[PDB]
Amino acid sequence: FGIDMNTDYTLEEVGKQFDVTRERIRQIEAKALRKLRHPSRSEVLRSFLDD
Amino acid sequence: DPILLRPVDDLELTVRSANCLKAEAIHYIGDLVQRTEVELLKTPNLGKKSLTEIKDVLASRGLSLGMRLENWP
């Protein structure tokens, strides 16, 4: 995601910079997202949804 | 209690300890604080490090073992 940088890179771009295939980076991103879903965490992130 | 009824997903465990609990079939935090050290340590694939970080997260979020319950659920 484009957080704190000029551009949002493709998963293949990030893989080539980290030297890994797309599927590994995809699992890594999904791992991070799943961890961020984890209650006891992301309480405030949930608070940023107003409806 | 708000957290004693919180399921073992909130315990911040791995899948090794997760399947340890599935082999024990404990969900709520009051339930996981029901049991003792060795009674859970005796189960398969469950050694010192598993229960160690178990008590680690317990003491980090105000829990521990040797506890007991009355009318739970």
Q: Could you state, in order of their start, the residue ranges of all structural domains in chain B?
A: 1-73
Task: Say if B14 is an interface residue toward chain A (CB within 8 Å).
Answer: no
Q: Contacts of residue A40 in chain B, CB cutoff 8 Å?
A: 10, 12, 61
Strand partners, B7: B28
Resolution in A: 3.4
d(CA A29, CA A36): 11
Q: Show the tokens assigned to A14.
A: 């990030």
Which chain A residue's Cα is nearest to B7? A39
Which chain B residue's Cα is nearest to A39? B10
**Helix (H), strand (E) at residue B44:** none
Q: Report the CATH number of the B1-73 domain.
A: 1.10.150.20
Q: Could you count the other beta carbons within 10 Å of the beta carbon of residue B40? A: 20
Q: Show the tokens assigned to A2.
A: 């484009």
Residue B65's region, left for phi above 0, alpha for psi from -120 to 50, else beta, is beta
Strand partners, B28: B7
